Design a protein around this ligand. Structure first.
Ligand SMILES: *Cc1c(COP(=O)(O)O)cnc(C)c1O
Ligand SMILES: *Cc1c(COP(=O)(O)O)cnc(C)c1O
Ligand SMILES: *Cc1c(COP(=O)(O)O)cnc(C)c1O
Ligand SMILES: *Cc1c(COP(=O)(O)O)cnc(C)c1O
Ligand SMILES: O=C(O)CCCC(=O)O
Ligand SMILES: O=C(O)CCCC(=O)O
Ligand SMILES: O=C(O)CCCC(=O)O
Ligand SMILES: O=C(O)CCCC(=O)O
Lengths: 449, 448, 449, 448
């Protein structure tokens, strides 16, 4: 029988083959090789249950990339970002990106022509690096003054989860100012009340994930200036600009949020959100050499010279930084402006149209001077139109859309909001389709209450 | 006037276009859009200066991937690993890989059908997760007996730099036993001298980068058993198996290095090394739930339920894990054995042939019971054949090969070695071409 | 065991397969078939040792072709250039190319609307054809005068090797005017001194390979006019325009080098150098029907008529002539001008920048009125900066560049030059990279003398 | 005004664009650039008028190539065959092909491990190299005995035109023994009558184009042996094996035609015929170093060493040799035999079936011991079935087939034959369709 078994293995179509007759292994390392077309097909087919990323309106990350980015990423699948000597031109492109991001954020013109900063996998790694640099600068300052350094704290607003991870992993007490009704962000008064000489720094979120709105660093900065005048305590900022960092420079250049403020010692952002890079690209820039403690830096060989690295990851692909550079050259300020405008235009259209459909109060309407291209809203207080925003999120899912409804944190856990993200590749015509599905979902719900 | 400029912008070939007449911007964010084919061309051409990855014999990482992996990675370009609810089947495939890797390393069969471990970007993140968990278990041990926890140290041999970064970033004193002539590894005697009540753990390197040889955990394990009997101090191990974790299980199954040893609480390896995954894949497995302190774990929603995450990175692509899972199913144990065997057959051929060409002493000759598929050698003490291994490396570079020569560390900084890595995609016929260039280089050097 | 051997042959990945475990056959015809993916992979991988053609700066031939040329060549892989009846439209396209090249070189407007000339594989074949036509025209002239025809000679400057091959294969004495310091080309005085009644013709090289400079035919032509007035000996020219033939018409149309000169009876050029065709395309044009002896022509069938062929090769692909025609239509004079300008611009930039780095004397600086887009230079006489140009060529190779250093011939064998060719696909940004590597190579050499 | 013209140039579909409204330039170098997609489209469409190469049954050359060959040729588009130092591994692969072809033809095992021979663009260049070498060896023979060298001749049968070009271009008198009814080849008796002390060599055609039959060198060889005994004149042979050199070694190994015969000093063949290479590949091999006069050889630098070149062409692509080498490794002797066998099985089927349809006399029926896989036939003497083979050829053309009818040369210019070539890619099912059209054509002709 084994002779014809081989014949069938050779000649059978992939759906007729004996190999595709079993459920895929999920518990132990498999013993045998299998026909490669069958292994590929089974996995391809499972991934349909992820759903359609273009209809995922919960994520802030890129769900479309141009044809040149597909090619560049494929060309770069084996290029190792950390091996600066072995892939020297990829390393040179990375360093150009550092200069360009620093220039966008108005970093002081660097002495030797190279800005201080690095690429990362994402804002998470970039925030941990900014956070370690803060803890170290604070330690040195406390040692100069003969104070103990065993109780650091960090003051912040409604941050993304990575900051809670930072605090846990590096033994820093987190002082989060809670959201409450009427102020869903860190205000200067509440911030100052949480500051003391053990505060390693303050972290405004320039593009809050929950609501889509900017926390503005300028009023916070004014308070810290007054704090130093009144107490002598000198506190710095790190801006978590995961979203806002590739938005405001293009569509709202007069907001003063970046290195134009002297206490901003570092800024981080996700290239793979509004920076237009594919997943796996983040940036952190320091204001100058003094803002990055040298004891955190590890030197590696690079072309008869040496380059300073600051990284948690080691080997990883260089495609994403190469793709980021392509977007910088191909679009420039002009192109980024047009692409971001298109997102804000779609958000404004949706905020405008959804307003006429129900009893809603908007927290974010996609104004460029207020936040990111997002639409965020709640049911108006003490109305019951016969559905919750959860019921509406569920109806929209029947058509493949992921549109999240969730409660806020802090003292706002009573409040349920729905948030729609407007990214590149969510064009007006495609938005109109979501809107048709929103109208049809409401029709259904008003008929089955 | 500007109309003839627009006409040319539309019609010019990309090498004749005005946009390709300038040097690419390097200092400031560019102001204007440019023709996409021109932007692509300039960058594509710059990247030729990286050289040829297939001829890079310095790296341990994958420099070839099969056609299915190219397809899967392109299909997964925008699938987010951290968003378990948004990409639920990518998440499920990830959990299968954790089970399979735990099985490979003889993790005790899991209670609830799911091994304790996680995917990472690479061994570096995986080692920091393993390190933090070691430091936390030690803190708890010390607190149960009323003792101070302010002076943690970690004992190790000739580790990769990520362990130096771990020590610096988490304020742990590193006790690195230095390499010395005649012992280029952590021996049990020196390991014990460095251990005390403040030792959070011992990290053997199951595949040392500098030499390619295994540090064998078993004799170290016997020593820590006597240490506990003698002193009452109970020390765990984490195995840094960045290369070895996907070699020995297939080609040297009788080496006892993994969870079969009681003191081994966690193990890490690089999928994108000998795991055959593309760049951006690592693993760490814990022996059971008790080995991972729950205060390090952050729970997320997953399909009505909740799953525990332990990660430093947040958003990052899921293609590498999907690729890994494809290699597991497509190759299985049988195919992994055949692929690694081809690498060892190539290392053994080169060790053999290079030995005829000069006065060389081999530190690693590509034997599977002793290490990874690498060739590592020095010039014999005493002899001077008229060249150093640096001159040899430079001659080989003229033909595009990257073959590193470097000094060893610690107390062996007088020893210069050359190391050749034999990876997937460095087949016998291709290695013969390297050997012909080695022969040509020596001839040239003897004539000068 | 043979049963599982087959299983493995079926199922094994290409790098795990038993077939890829041996060194490739190099001595005898192999006996067995092998899996086709393994045969392809082994050969693909060997070819990496060729290096990167885009970084080969020694060659004058095309190392990049546009996407339409890749498609047209693939479509034409089986189309046979010599089979005029069997591939009749490919044959018609070839004939159009002849008219267009003749028109570019100012050939007299042809009587019946078809110029006299042919496509070849390259300038080598085209030069042998021009050379045979010269030998035959001379024989006839010598017979009319009752002189013997057993000692033909050919007068020339610093020619490419094909002319030495011509002389050896057709029993013609080669009278090469040697290069000497101060005149690296054939001058009118030395040329006339080598001319006699046995001279079948004179061959100026319009784009000398060694230096990159034009030998100008006009001053030579004036001398031959005077020679005929003084002695009655009437000598013709063939221009070897391998390079210059697709440069000067676009960027220096006022140089009189072509059929505007009455003694120019034929001209050859390589399409696959500056003609922008892929390797395998050359052209030779005769001034009129009388310049091509009929006894050298073989007629073949073509559409109820007959076409005259003159060719050494027989079967060969027609893709290259098809690609040449596409470039003619797609670029025209306008497009060729822009592409050649881009090469001259890169050469000027490199001549300018290299000048500041060392004690150099330039022989070619990429001026369009003087020669081709090449940079050619030597160490200044009696300086020793502690390296030779050989040492510099070697350092540049570490980064994958092929930049040749070599001695000149004739009485200039003391002189070592370095030559950089600037072709299509060697854009300014890419040139800047070579320049960085040149600066870094000099740093190294001044530190290890 | 001109702004609406630019807008249209950007937006128009390629068949709606203004640029495609004119007839392509044919007389003068064009003045302006045009949209690249339009330039491509016009030319692509013109090339439909070539007809379908797969249906061209007149040619001996490859009209199909496998996917790997398409890839290799595209990858080699810019690799220069003549630049041995600049493309050194392309050069090395070329030298392997020379060894393998010499081995196939039973060349005496080479002294220094490298056969004497070269790749060429085709048999035509290869025959001129072989011819020049014959003329030079003869010159030297004559000079050693004080004799004049001004009247060389060459003796041959029904050769392809390249031999006529060789004679004209190198001033050699051609002594072509003409075909005649009952003997359509050079027989030993007429060959000897044409030989004298001025004969540079004899060129048998191992695969005659006009008929498809082999001229067998062995009986000619026996005759030249008697000639030397009788007269003392020593004459060499060059075999023009343009088709036969890649057939007989695989399917008729017992035919003695190659270097097994002492007088055979050189052999040429077309790779791009039955060698399975794409257009642009030929070979010529010499029996040893002595057979190739060194004054014809031009040396070039190759990796510290130097190699001898003999070539008329200079720059030309290296893809065809790389492709050839791929077919050698991928097929070997086993696969070449299976491919050629399929061609002979198709010729034998057609000879068989066409014989039932009319009053025909076969000159070639696709037997491997007699010739190449071709069908060649005439109308039987006497009979007139109401059509000529020209009418038949024209009816077949209505369905896209190119099947030539033509008169034979020499003293047989009264004989009209039809010839069908059975190449790779003319499979049994496709040949059945040709036979159905042949049947339909005859029916039509009988009704008119
Ligand atoms: C996304 C985000 C992060 C996390 O960054 P990744 O790019 O996902 O690593 C941190 N903070 C904010 C405000 C974010 O939006
Ligand atoms: C490669 C390696 C590392 C680093 O892992 P990455 O996968 O590069 O992050 C750590 N330790 C050892 C022994 C290694 O070989
Ligand atoms: C290139 C060249 C040749 C040879 O032509 P191919 O195109 O290489 O056959 C002859 N003469 C000169 C001046 C050349 O530049
Ligand atoms: C085809 C052929 C030739 C010509 O060879 P090409 O490969 O077309 O140059 C010469 N002689 C014979 C017998 C042929 O068949
Ligand atoms: O943008 C992401 O993918 C992660 C954060 C927001 C979310 O998806 O819920
Ligand atoms: O494997 C790698 O790529 C990183 C470390 C080893 C090296 O390249 O030297
Ligand atoms: O252009 C070529 O390829 C041949 C001549 C110049 C050279 O390469 O050396
Ligand atoms: O094989 C060829 O293509 C050329 C000669 C034979 C013919 O086509 O008639």
């Amino acid at each position: 029988k084994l002779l014809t078994d081989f014949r069938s293995e050779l000649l059978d179509s992939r759906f007729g083959a004996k190999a595709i007759s079993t459920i895929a292994e999920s518990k132990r390392f498999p013993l045998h090789e299998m026909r490669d077309d069958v292994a590929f097909q089974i996995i391809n087919d499972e991934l349909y249950l992820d759903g359609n990323a273009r209809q995922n309106l919960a994520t802030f990350c890129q769900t479309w990339d141009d044809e040149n980015v597909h090619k560049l990423m494929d060309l770069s699948i084996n290029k190792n970002w950390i091996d600066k000597e072995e892939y020297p031109q990829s390393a040179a492109i990375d360093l150009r990106c550092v200069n360009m991001v620093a220039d966008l954020w108005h970093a002081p013109a660097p002495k030797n022509g190279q800005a201080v900063g690095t690429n990362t996998i994402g804002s998470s790694e970039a925030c941990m690096l900014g956070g370690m640099a803060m803890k170290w600068r604070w330690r040195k300052r406390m040692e100069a003054a003969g104070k103990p350094t065993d109780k650091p704290n960090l003051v912040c607003g409604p941050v993304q989860i990575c900051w809670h991870k930072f605090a846990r992993y590096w033994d820093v007490e987190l002082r989060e100012i809670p959201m409450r009704p009427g102020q869903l962000f860190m205000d200067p008064k509440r911030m100052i009340e949480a500051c003391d000489e053990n505060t390693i720094g303050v972290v405004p979120t320039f593009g809050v994930t929950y609501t889509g709105n900017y926390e503005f660093p300028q009023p916070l900065h004014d308070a810290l200036d007054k704090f130093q005048a009144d107490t002598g305590i000198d506190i710095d900022m790190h801006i978590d600009a995961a979203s806002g960092g590739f938005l405001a420079p293009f569509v709202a250049p007069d907001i003063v949020w970046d290195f134009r403020l002297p206490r901003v010692k570092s800024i981080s952002a996700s290239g793979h959100k509004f920076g237009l890079a594919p997943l796996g690209c983040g940036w952190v820039i320091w204001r100058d050499e003094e803002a990055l403690p040298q004891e955190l830096v590890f030197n590696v060989d690079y072309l008869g010279g040496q380059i300073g690295t600051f990284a948690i990851n080691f080997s990883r692909p260089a495609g994403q930084v190469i793709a980021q550079y392509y977007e910088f050259l191909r679009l420039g300020r002009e192109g980024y402006t047009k692409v971001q405008n298109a997102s804000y235009q779609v958000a404004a259209y949706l905020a405008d149209e959804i307003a006429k459909l129900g009893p809603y109060e908007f927290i974010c309407t996609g104004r460029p001077d207020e936040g990111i291209p997002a639409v965020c809203f709640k049911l108006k207080d003490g109305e019951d139109p016969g559905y919750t925003l959860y019921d509406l999120s569920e109806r929209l899912r029947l058509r493949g859309w992921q549109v999240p409804a969730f409660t806020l944190g802090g003292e706002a856990t009573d409040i349920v909001v729905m948030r729609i993200m407007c990214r590149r590749g969510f064009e007006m015509d495609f938005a109109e389709l979501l809107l048709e599905d929103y109208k049809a979902s409401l029709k259904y719900l008003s008929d089955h209450p």
